[PDB]
Amino acid sequence: CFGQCQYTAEEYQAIQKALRQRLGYIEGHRVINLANEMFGYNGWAHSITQQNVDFVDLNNGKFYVGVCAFVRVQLKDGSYHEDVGYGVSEGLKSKALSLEKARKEAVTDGLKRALRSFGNAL
Amino acid sequence: AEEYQAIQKALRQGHRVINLANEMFGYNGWAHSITQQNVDFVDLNNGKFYVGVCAFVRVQLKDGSYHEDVGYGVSEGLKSKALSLEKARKEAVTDGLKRALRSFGNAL
Amino acid sequence: EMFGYNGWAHSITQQNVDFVDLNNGKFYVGVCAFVRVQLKDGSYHEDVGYGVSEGLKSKALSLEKARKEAVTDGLKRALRSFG
Amino acid sequence: CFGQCQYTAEEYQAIQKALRQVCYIEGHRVINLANEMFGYNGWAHSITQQNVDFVDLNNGKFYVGVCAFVRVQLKDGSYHEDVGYGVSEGLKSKALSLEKARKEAVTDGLKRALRSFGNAL
Amino acid sequence: CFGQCQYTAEEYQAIQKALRQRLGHRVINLANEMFGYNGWAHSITQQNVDFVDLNNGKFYVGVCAFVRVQLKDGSYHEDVGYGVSEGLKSKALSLEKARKEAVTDGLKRALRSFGNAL
Amino acid sequence: CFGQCQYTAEEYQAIQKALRQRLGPIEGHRVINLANEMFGYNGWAHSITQQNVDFVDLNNGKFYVGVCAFVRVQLKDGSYHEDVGYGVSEGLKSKALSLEKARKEAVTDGLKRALRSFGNAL
Amino acid sequence: CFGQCQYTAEEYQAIQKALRQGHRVINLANEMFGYNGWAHSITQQNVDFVDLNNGKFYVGVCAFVRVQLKDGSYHEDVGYGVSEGLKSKALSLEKARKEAVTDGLKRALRSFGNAL
Amino acid sequence: TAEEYQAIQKALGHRVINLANEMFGYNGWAHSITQQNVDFVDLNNGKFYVGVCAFVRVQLKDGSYHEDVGYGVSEGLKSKALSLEKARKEAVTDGLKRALRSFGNAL
Amino acid sequence: GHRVINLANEMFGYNGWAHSITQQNVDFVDLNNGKFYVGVCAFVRVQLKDGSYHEDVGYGVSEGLKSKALSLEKARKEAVTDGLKRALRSFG
Amino acid sequence: WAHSITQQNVDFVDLNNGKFYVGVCAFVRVQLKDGSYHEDVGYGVSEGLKSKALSLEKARKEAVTDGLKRAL
């Protein structure tokens, strides 16, 4: 099953050389496509380990919100990483909208930052 | 086995997304669940309801490959608790399940 | 319903009462139940059951029937995924 | 799976031989260095706990300070841990101060936890 | 697998002889040289800010950390490092110094329990 | 694996005879050295099960500190021992130094006392 | 491993026969069981009370000094210890707890037979 | 194994301990203090006064176990700690006596 | 004497049955005239080698007694013994 | 069969004129050898008793019986 398989030497080396094709910045969907092509559709998973809210203030009618969320990224073999995402949704004037924005931006930023460690190609 | 190449290349290309997933991954080959849910807040200021909820969803395939994402639902202006919590705690699940399947490929 | 309660099974993962109100003079109750449907082929899903009773006489009367309705609705809606 | 397979003699010799070869270590270079030295399938990395110390608000600034614990691990079974400490100052919006502190802490922890496997890192 | 392995007799005696010699970065380097990078591990089981006093502007900090050291055989060791701090006019820096010195001293002390060569 | 394996008969008799003898010539370092030589660097472990600060006070510009500790030795065979060490400090001007001394002497005293249970040699 | 080995019949009978007959108790237990025949641990310890009459402290501590044996049989027993006259609180608690542990170790060990 | 049970069935201060040792063997029975509660303390006229309870427990080789609740008091003493010491020790001994009594006519 | 104890011992065997105490709480004691009353509950328990078990409840009483020790000890013993009698009756 | 008392609470203790009145409610449980189980909370009161001791003795039995007759 996922997280318990092993790769072949030649494909392992091909992937290893692929991941170092370094550029030398947010492209949310494009990172999903890149991962799908470099590890396959059936290659990677990511869970939201935790999600806490730091502050929901109403200073001047305008809201201010802060959400921090830890995300985890795993590859078919069983290796894993983890990083601290963080989304901010200041400015809005409908608590539901600020919560939408922060809670959906923190996860994406975390998935971006947790995927730059498997290689420099991402 | 050969179907692996077919699915991988095909992925490279509303409620209809559920049937789309059933056709693409097989109508017996995709599952989901709700790992957690939290009524975020309820408030009234002018005799009306603003109910929001955050709901996490999970999706896994036949071989165990999985993903997750945050779902969210909102409803404003409704008179009673019944309808507002008929709407938000009802649509957050679908919104999350829509935003989770997009991660598996462009075709979704 | 081709197979019925033999090709698929159900169970409430968790339930919690949302709100109970009496400002109107009668019991206003809202309940939620999470049901999961599992198939013998390994496919499974889950949906948020939900039921409500408005302005009934007693807490138990407004709560038990609302719970039954919520479970029935959750079962009814959880079966969409096999369409 | 990860953390269970054991090296072969030549691999162990190579890695050991490699690892032996006031300003900080520039930060992000360590991820590339470690990835090339152990491999992408080589190691893992996790945050076992993260906790927030004072968030004071003197004279309108914000001084968030966070602490972190970073577990590194090689596929052979070894592991390590260390304590990192983000900081902040001057930022006028708690969103930015929290962001800076929380993000800096984990990188610092990863650096100080990789430094324990040798001098080269 | 780490913890489930047992040293080989010849290497076991070799290490026995090694650790009986007569002599922060130095300690870690020496531990790596003897046991090897694969050889051992290091964990932090608990921590606690003992006191965070504020006398006259300075920030007197104190952190107690229990560091565990372990070897692929299964041997444990634990000790109590205490990282003092003093004189700093900014709270964050004082807490940083204390929390780092704590684990450093803990590792030092917990390693001495193995042999005199440390 | 340590803690799940028994001693070998010849080593058993050697250890038995060695422990029964008596010191010829206690300070902490020598106990550590003798224990190491007696079992090696691989024959045991020591850990702190609990450590509560019994009291900390002040009387005219100083700190009478005191701490407790529950050390615990163990041997490859599974036998174990425990004992309550106890530390003290007087006249120190700074709280940090007093807590330092107390916490540090506690564990070493506990180690000496817990080891002593095995034989007269120590 | 400790807590799972069965006693060899000859050793069982020998220890039983020798059973029908503090530093002293520690040594005797070590010789009768061997250096790896038993273990001892502190299950709980709660300062029963403290006090101060005229600058001299009073202390009291309880200890449930579990003492175990290779075959798996075990005993526990309430200990106790006390101090008086001592002018320093830390010294008082040190003496009290140190004596309580050994008193419990005695009373527990003085149970497997008249030998102890 | 059944022979030991049959022999015990046919058969059924320090004397209770000695009888238990002779009856079950040095490894035949354990005893542990499940809980201890101090029910009062008094300072009437300089003489302390205390009683304690303890849910002593016993076990045999095959796992069959019992339990009970003893009690001991202390009067006429001058030092509190001495009072509690005697109370706890006597309570444990008396509870053990009652637990052993529970097992049969032999005890 | 508590003949029920001996009867159970002879019927099931000394290892055939068991005993336990699950919780005990003094409902009250009062200083009515210096002859304190005492009656204390006790969640007794009993089992058997076959697995079938029966919890129960008991409540002894300490009639007027000038001695606290006698009252408390008598209550604590009587509660357990009466509960044991009750549970044994259920076993049959 | 087996039964247990997993919670219990005396509701009312009362006295009119040297004659006590009391109320209790106990949380009984049951089980069966086949793995199935039954459960029913009960209730019990004692009225017009000479001593509080008798009332407190009686109420627990009445509550336990009320729960058990239903659950069993």
Numbering used by the authors:
A (entry chain C): 25 to 48, 65 to 162
B (entry chain B): 33 to 45, 68 to 162
C (entry chain A): 77 to 159
D (entry chain D): 25 to 45, 63 to 162
E (entry chain E): 25 to 47, 68 to 162
F (entry chain F): 25 to 49, 66 to 162
G (entry chain G): 25 to 45, 68 to 162
H (entry chain H): 32 to 43, 68 to 162
Authors' own words:
When visualized using cryo-EM, we found that the two species of full-length RAD52 represent open (RAD52-OR, peak 1) and closed (RAD52-CR, peak 2) ring forms. The 11-subunit closed rings exhibit features similar to the RAD52 NTD, whereas the RAD52 open rings have one or more subunits missing. The structures of RAD52-CR (2.9 Å) and RAD52-OR (3.2 Å) were determined using cryo-EM. The RAD52-OR structures contained a maximum of ten subunits, although open rings with fewer subunits were also observed. The structure of each subunit in the open ring was similar to that of the closed ring. As expected, the cryo-EM density around the site of ring opening was not as well resolved as other parts of the structure. Consistent with this, in addition to the ten-subunit open ring, our analysis of two-dimensional (2D) averages and three-dimensional (3D) classes indicated the presence of RAD52-OR structures with fewer subunits. The RAD52 open rings exhibited a high affinity (KD = 0.3 ± 0.1 nM) for 40-nucleotide-long ssDNA but not double-stranded DNA (dsDNA), as measured by fluorescence anisotropy. The RAD52-ORs annealed ssDNA in reactions stimulated by RPA, whereas the RAD52-CRs exhibited a reduced ability to promote annealing that was unaffected by the presence or absence of RPA. Importantly, RAD52 adopts open- and closed-ring configurations, such that the open rings represent the active form of the protein for SSA.
Central to these functions, RAD52 promotes the annealing of complementary single-stranded DNA (ssDNA)8,9 and provides an alternative to BRCA2/RAD51-dependent homologous recombination repair. Instead, cryo-electron microscopy and biochemical analyses revealed that ssDNA annealing is driven by RAD52 open rings in association with replication protein-A (RPA). RPA associates with RAD52 at the site of ring opening with critical interactions occurring between the RPA-interacting domain of RAD52 and the winged helix domain of RPA2. Our studies provide structural snapshots throughout the annealing process and define the molecular mechanism of ssDNA annealing by the RAD52–RPA complex.
